[PDB]
Design an enzyme around this catalytic site. Structure first.
Site, PDB file in Angstrom:
ATOM      1  N   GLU A  11      33.545  34.262  70.864  1.00  0.00           N
ATOM      2  CA  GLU A  11      32.574  35.323  70.609  1.00  0.00           C
ATOM      3  C   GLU A  11      32.618  36.503  71.540  1.00  0.00           C
ATOM      4  O   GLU A  11      32.127  37.567  71.173  1.00  0.00           O
ATOM      5  CB  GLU A  11      31.121  34.768  70.671  1.00  0.00           C
ATOM      6  CG  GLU A  11      30.784  33.709  69.625  1.00  0.00           C
ATOM      7  CD  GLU A  11      30.870  34.180  68.207  1.00  0.00           C
ATOM      8  OE1 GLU A  11      30.828  35.468  68.044  1.00  0.00           O
ATOM      9  OE2 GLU A  11      30.853  33.424  67.293  1.00  0.00           O
ATOM     10  N   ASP A  20      29.300  42.975  64.454  1.00  0.00           N
ATOM     11  CA  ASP A  20      30.183  41.841  64.411  1.00  0.00           C
ATOM     12  C   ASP A  20      31.299  42.074  63.391  1.00  0.00           C
ATOM     13  O   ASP A  20      31.441  43.185  62.862  1.00  0.00           O
ATOM     14  CB  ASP A  20      29.428  40.512  64.247  1.00  0.00           C
ATOM     15  CG  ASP A  20      28.831  40.237  62.885  1.00  0.00           C
ATOM     16  OD1 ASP A  20      29.077  41.120  61.979  1.00  0.00           O
ATOM     17  OD2 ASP A  20      28.187  39.262  62.643  1.00  0.00           O
ATOM     18  N   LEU A  32      23.413  37.095  66.589  1.00  0.00           N
ATOM     19  CA  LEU A  32      23.170  38.006  65.497  1.00  0.00           C
ATOM     20  C   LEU A  32      21.756  38.507  65.519  1.00  0.00           C
ATOM     21  O   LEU A  32      20.820  37.740  65.552  1.00  0.00           O
ATOM     22  CB  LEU A  32      23.346  37.246  64.196  1.00  0.00           C
ATOM     23  CG  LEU A  32      22.896  38.101  63.021  1.00  0.00           C
ATOM     24  CD1 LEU A  32      23.805  39.324  62.867  1.00  0.00           C
ATOM     25  CD2 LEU A  32      22.877  37.313  61.714  1.00  0.00           C
TER      26      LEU A  32
END
Ligand SMILES: c1ccc2[nH]ccc2c1
Ligand SMILES: [Cl-]
Ligand SMILES: [Cl-]
Length: 162
Positions: A11, A20, A32
């Protein structure tokens, strides 16, 4: 290696609101914020999560905090999921990490749609599961990350991350 280090590699770490791979407002370690196309809505979601007027920026500690929370929530969701739990329970420690990585990325829902793969994993048919996993939007959209996770399920080792 462990789940935290694994996801940290997958990530990355960003201290400023970013988009993203799907174009959604995110921050920190893959947290998120919202699917809404609105930056304002994302900054409000951010402030609500951190508990302060952040102005779209957080510190490293605040990122790590969101990350701890998200990992814990993922595991807890898998354990509450009647479709997921039994699979997860059948796996060894390394593979459980791969299962959490998928949930973290795509949600419990997203994962619940890999019915055929789950059944293969539960049966420990590693090579067949790896092939079935690859036939997915997931694999076509984020191939390098998918390959790492798939290798993990296939081998039961951290080789893909070394
Ligand atoms: C639980 C949660 C996610 C998973 N991905 C593959 C197996 C599995 C089990
Ligand atoms: Cl939150
Ligand atoms: Cl990728």
């Amino acid at each position: 290696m462990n789940i935290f280090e694994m996801l940290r590699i997958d990530e990355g770490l960003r201290l400023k609101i970013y988009k993203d791979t799907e174009g959604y407002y995110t921050i920190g370690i893959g947290h998120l914020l919202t699917k809404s196309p609105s930056l304002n809505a994302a900054k409000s979601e951010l402030d609500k999560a951190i508990g302060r007027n952040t102005n779209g920026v957080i510190t490293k500690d605040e990122a790590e905090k969101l990350f701890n929370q998200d990992v814990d929530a993922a595991v807890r969701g898998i354990l509450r999921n009647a479709k997921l739990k039994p699979v997860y329970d059948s796996l060894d420690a390394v593979r459980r990490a791969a299962a959490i990585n998928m949930v973290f990325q795509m949600g419990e829902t997203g994962v619940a749609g890999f019915t055929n793969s789950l059944r293969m994993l539960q049966q420990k048919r590693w090579d067949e599961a790896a092939v079935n996993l690859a036939k997915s939007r997931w694999y076509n959209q984020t191939p390098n990350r998918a390959k790492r996770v798939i290798t993990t399920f296939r081998t039961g080792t951290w080789d893909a991350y070394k």
